[PDB]
């Protein structure tokens, strides 16, 4: 973040979508929730129909309980690409945000079926399975999550 502040010009910083994504993910990692949202909104302003890595935003907006923006983003993402796994995991995150979670598990497993090498879908599945007061399924899901991404 200090390197952004010093070694990155402001005009490049507030214009590059990739720098915005990296900066938002970084501020997520420091658990700076307010900072990340007002730049991810700028990212959506730059291009609404971009998927890349929307898992971070889905995780953020689940915490902030913004049901309407999440609904809009999920609708737009599906209308753009149905086969990208991040879109399906965002939908499952919204569904878990609402209330029902069995269909969220099913959506997550389908998203993992679209691309077996997506570790964040596995780890989101495992984190969700804790809410199902079930541990063995959660434990197996966590193990298969860590299998996909060694450093997670």
């Amino acid at each position: 973040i200090r390197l952004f502040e010093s070694q990155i010009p402001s005009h490049i910083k507030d214009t590059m979508p990739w720098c915005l994504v990296q900066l938002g993910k970084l501020h997520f990692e420091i658990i700076n929730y307010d900072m990340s949202l007002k730049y991810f909104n700028r990212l959506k302003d730059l291009q609404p129909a971009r998927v890349k890595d929307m898992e971070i935003f889905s995780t953020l907006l689940w915490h902030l309980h913004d049901k309407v923006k999440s609904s809009n983003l999920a609708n737009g993402l599906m209308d753009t690409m149905p086969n990208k796994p991040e879109t399906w995991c965002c939908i499952g995150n919204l569904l878990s945000l609402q209330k029902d979670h069995d269909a969220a598990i099913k959506a997550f497993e389908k998203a993992t079926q679209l691309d077996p090498n997506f570790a964040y879908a596995y780890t989101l599945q495992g984190h969700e399975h804790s809410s199902n007061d079930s541990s063995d399924s959660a434990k197996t899901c966590y193990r298969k999550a860590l299998a996909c991404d060694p450093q997670h």
């Binding site: 658990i31 995780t59 689940w62 915490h63 995150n93 989101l124 984190h127």
Partner: peptide, 27 residues
């Protein structure tokens, strides 16, 4: 056991039943 119901009923429902015994996050 529910041997009889009110006003000479036939069957019986059971709305609730419970048993009692003694003894922030990252997504």
């Amino acid at each position: 056991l529910f041997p009889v119901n009110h006003e000479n009923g036939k069957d019986t429902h059971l709305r609730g039943i419970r048993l009692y015994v003694p003894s922030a996050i990252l997504r």
